[PDB]
Design a protein around this ligand. Structure first.
Ligand SMILES: Cc1cc2c(cc1C)N(C[C@H](O)[C@H](O)[C@H](O)COP(=O)(O)OP(=O)(O)OC[C@H]1O[C@@H](n3cnc4c(N)ncnc43)[C@H](O)[C@@H]1O)c1[nH]c(=O)[nH]c(=O)c1N2
Length: 457
DNA sequence: ATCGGCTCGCGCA
DNA sequence: TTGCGCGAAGCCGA
């Protein structure tokens, strides 16, 4: 293993007890550097490795769609891990409180966790550091190149981040070793799933006839299913990807984001498999740029800008520009609730909101348009930001993610973009138009697909 | 230093 | 639709 993937959070003397991998971002047993590091620490100390996962109350802020997807994955993971004689413990409550107590009760010798740049994880990590006396390590298992190694500062643009990342790819793009089962031999999911579903039922998104909007058959959860999705992408869609990625009437994306978000598949694995596939060099290049440069610069953004979900993290040129247009008359102003229900004047905007409500995965091209029109038809840039984050995290399966905050900040605040022609309301922020979409794809077919969904509560 | 080059709309063929 | 050249625009880094 490359040691630059590990960072020490707290030093100390190893205990005589097991190695505890506090799993949080990377919910998978294969292709997982955090779990492979924990197992190796355990092997040379001659103790078992165990996995712990803390189910927090944050699920109440999203929907059944994300909760079920994640919990069904965990049910499959629990079996996979137990097949390698690795027990998994599912705690309920505040990780700051619960992880400390678990380490004490269970007499852990060493604590390991995976890496996320979101604020709340760093808050928990500092709470855990105060509650423990054993060594504490962090492993970047989500990025190909460890986030603190790729760059030491906020990267202004993809083209400044690209060479830094590619300079390190020969070193860090490598195969994964096998997870060795435990040799030393060492609250109930289903109850948790059923209890949480009952808590969320009053907030389910429903049609007029009381049927749920959400269609759960577009993405089967879990590690096994994720691998099939990757394989059928390489086999059927990667060749057309470069030419058709921006056409929402074609189902030509990898569809991997719900699995990448929950860590049910490793993007390093996807990159390995795509690198070795014989297909169109332009498609491979377009796809590797998205899953390497744009995904990992989103961790760069959140990790070096703690206010990544706020106006104040925009570049100065964009703050100045949007400020100067704060008093311009908006052509329309919608509330959160009229956006949410798809009640704007624009049938193409409404159709993308319908795709979001019913599938939980809006086409990537439409996310740019969707977010830019929220800025255009809301009373202020801060309200636009609020509305865009709220609908993104409530309804996207891949939401509550660095990629989301960075994509919204790109769309509304020009983060990782540049300045364009000055307009009213949106200032110098890059503009997108309904007529622009019409030159690029059959807008009418996309609208027609989602039209019959004004059947809304 | 100093300038080439970055993930839209629109006219046109 | 399809590709191209152009426009308007601020700034990083060889
Ligand atoms: C306003 C807005 C809002 C969001 C996002 C972008 C924008 C403009 N995205 C990013 C992107 O739209 C999304 O990852 C893909 O549409 C996911 O679909 P596929 O995996 O099929 O894409 P596709 O197969 O094209 O891409 C493969 C992977 O590359 C990465 N990638 C692609 N486009 C990216 C982008 N613009 N930024 C960062 N990484 C990118 C993602 O990991 C994606 O899963 C996002 N993504 C996400 O994971 N969670 C979210 O909440 C959102 N929400």
């Amino acid at each position: 293993m490359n040691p630059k993937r590990i960072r020490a959070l707290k030093s100390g003397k190893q205990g005589d007890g097991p190695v505890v991998y506090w799993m949080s971002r990377d919910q998978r047993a294969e292709d997982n550097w955090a779990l492979l590091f924990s197992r190796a620490i355990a092997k040379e100390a001659n103790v078992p490795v165990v996995v712990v996962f803390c189910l927090t109350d944050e699920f109440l802020e999203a929907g059944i769609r994300q909760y079920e997807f994640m919990l069904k994955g965990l049910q499959e993971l629990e079996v996979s891990l137990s097949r390698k004689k690795i027990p998994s413990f599912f705690l309920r409550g505040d990780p700051g409180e619960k992880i400390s107590r678990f380490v004490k009760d269970y007499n852990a010798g060493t604590l390991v966790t995976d890496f996320s740049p979101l604020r709340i994880k760093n808050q928990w990590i500092e709470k855990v550091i105060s509650g423990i006396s054993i060594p504490f390590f962090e492993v970047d298992a989500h990025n190909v190149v460890p986030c603190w190694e790729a760059s030491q500062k906020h990267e202004y643009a993809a083209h400044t981040f690209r060479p830094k990342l590619y300079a390190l790819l020969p070193e860090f793009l490598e195969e994964f070793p096998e997870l060795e089962p435990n040799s030393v031999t060492p609250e109930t999911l289903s109850d948790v799933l059923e209890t949480g579903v009952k808590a969320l039922l009053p907030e389910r998104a429903l049609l007029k006839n009381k049927d749920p909007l959400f269609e759960p058959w577009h993405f089967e959860p879990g590690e096994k299913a994720a691998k099939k999705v990757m394989e059928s992408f390489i086999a059927d869609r990667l060749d057309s990807y470069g030419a058709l990625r921006n056409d929402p009437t074609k189902n030509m994306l990898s569809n991997l984001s719900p699995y990448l978000h929950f860590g049910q598949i490793s993007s390093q694995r996807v990159v390995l498999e795509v690198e070795k596939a014989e297909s169109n060099p332009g498609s491979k290049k377009a796809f590797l740029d998205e899953i390497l440069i744009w995904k990992e610069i989103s961790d760069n953004f959140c990790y070096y800008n703690p206010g990544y979900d706020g106006f104040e993290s925009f570049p100065s040129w964009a703050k100045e520009s949007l400020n100067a247009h704060r008093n311009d008359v908006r052509s329309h102003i919608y509330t959160l609730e009229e956006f949410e229900a798809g009640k704007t004047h624009d049938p193409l905007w409404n159709a993308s909101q319908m795709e979001l409500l019913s599938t939980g995965k809006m086409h990537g091209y439409m996310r740019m348009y969707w977010a830019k029109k929220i800025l255009e038809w809301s009373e202020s840039p801060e309200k636009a930001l609020e509305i865009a984050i709220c609908l993104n995290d409530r309804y996207e399966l891949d939401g509550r993610d660095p990629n989301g905050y960075a994509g919204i900040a790109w769309s509304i605040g020009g983060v990782h973009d540049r300045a364009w022609g000055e307009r009213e309301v949106t200032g110098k922020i890059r503009y997108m138009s309904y007529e622009g979409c019409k030159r690029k794809f059959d807008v009418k077919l996309y609208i027609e697909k989602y039209s019959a969904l004004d059947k809304l509560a």
